[PDB]
Amino acid sequence: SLDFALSLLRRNIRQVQTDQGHFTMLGVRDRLAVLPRHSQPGKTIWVEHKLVSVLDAVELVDEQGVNLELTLITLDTNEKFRDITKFIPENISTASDATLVINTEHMPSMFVPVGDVVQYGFLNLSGKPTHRTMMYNFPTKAGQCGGVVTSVGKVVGIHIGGNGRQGFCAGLKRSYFAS
Ligand SMILES: *C(=O)[C@H](C[C@@H]1CCNC1=O)NC(=O)[C@H](Cc1ccccc1)NC(=O)c1cc2ccccc2[nH]1
C-alpha cells in the first residue's frame, strides 16, 4: 500500500538542494524540518527551486555526544507542515516491509520497497561515526539521502548511507522534534 507514503509526499516531503547536492527533506510540524547532516544546509536552501532562508540548524548528537546524522532546521516561512509527530515512535523502532519515500529533482515522488529495517546501531561511513542507525538489505544509491523510511503508519528513519548492496538510516524518535 502506497497510501500513507503518498500522504507524506503531498504534505511533508520536499525536493531540496544544498551545496552538497540533491536531498529529500521531511517537514515535521510548523517550520521544523529534518535533513541528513551531511547535506549541510546553509543560511539558505533551495526548496523545489525556491530560495528559502534557514533561521536555525542543529546537528543532532546522542547523549554520548556522537553524531546522529540528522540536522533539524527552521525555515523562514509562514507555511506550516502538517504535524506528523504522532507518526514518529517514542523509541527508535525497527520495522518490517518498509517503504523508503524519496523526493528529489532526480528521483521524484519515489516509493522504494526496502524490506525489513533492522537494528544496526553504531555505524562508521567515511571514517565518521553515527549512532542509532538501522539497515535494510536494499541497494540504495547516491541521491536518496533524506528519504523517509515508513512502515505501518509510522515514520521510523531518514536515509543516510549505503555500501552498494545495503542501505542505512538514522532512526527517528518523537522527542527529537519536541519544543
Ligand atoms: C546520500 O547522500 C548517500 C547515500 C549512499 C551513497 C551510496 N549508497 C547510498 O545509499 N550517503 C552517503 O554518501 C554517505 C554520507 C555520510 C553519512 C554519514 C557519515 C558520513 C558520510 N556515505 C556513505 O554512504 C558511504 C561512504 C562510503 C565509503 C566507502 C564505501 C562506501 C561508502 N558509503
Side-chain angles (χ1 to χ4, degrees), residues 1-85 87-118 120-153 155-179:
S1 171
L2 303 190
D3 297 75
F4 179 60
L6 170 62
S7 71
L8 294 170
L9 268 178
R10 284 187 297 235
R11 309 173 187 273
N12 297 88
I13 299 177
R14 304 293 179 249
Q15 310 181 356
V16 306
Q17 297 182 49
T18 72
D19 286 343
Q20 285 286 354
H22 291 261
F23 298 91
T24 296
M25 181 175 70
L26 176 65
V28 175
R29 62 169 174 77
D30 301 301
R31 310 162 293 170
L32 178 62
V34 63
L35 283 168
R37 182 205 54 77
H38 66 268
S39 70
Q40 299 179 322
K43 316 285 274 193
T44 61
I45 186 171
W46 291 100
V47 184
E48 287 160 9
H49 285 236
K50 178 179 189 166
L51 190 65
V52 181
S53 292
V54 176
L55 296 175
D56 192 51
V58 184
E59 302 183 321
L60 303 187
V61 297
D62 71 4
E63 288 85 355
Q64 305 175 18
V66 179
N67 176 53
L68 295 170
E69 201 55 28
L70 298 167
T71 298
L72 300 184
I73 63 173
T74 301
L75 300 170
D76 190 5
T77 178
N78 288 326
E79 189 213 359
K80 291 192 183 67
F81 297 116
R82 196 162 78 172
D83 190 341
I84 56 163
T85 50
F87 300 125
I88 303 175
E90 291 207 324
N91 307 114
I92 307 283
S93 298
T94 58
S96 70
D97 198 12
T99 301
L100 175 60
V101 187
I102 292 152
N103 195 22
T104 80
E105 176 165 352
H106 295 155
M107 297 179 193
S109 312
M110 173 182 278
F111 307 81
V112 181
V114 297
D116 287 9
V117 178
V118 303
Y120 197 93
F122 176 23
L123 178 69
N124 292 274
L125 296 171
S126 292
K128 182 160 185 66
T130 303
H131 283 181
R132 299 180 182 159
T133 70
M134 295 182 287
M135 190 183 83
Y136 16 100
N137 190 24
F138 187 89
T140 54
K141 314 181 301 190
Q144 298 185 323
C145 286
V148 182
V149 184
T150 70
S151 176
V152 311
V155 175
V156 305
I158 299 294
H159 188 70
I160 63 168
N163 60 16
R165 300 302 207 264
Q166 290 75 45
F168 302 90
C169 65
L172 294 184
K173 62 179 185 173
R174 189 174 308 159
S175 65
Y176 292 162
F177 304 96
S179 174

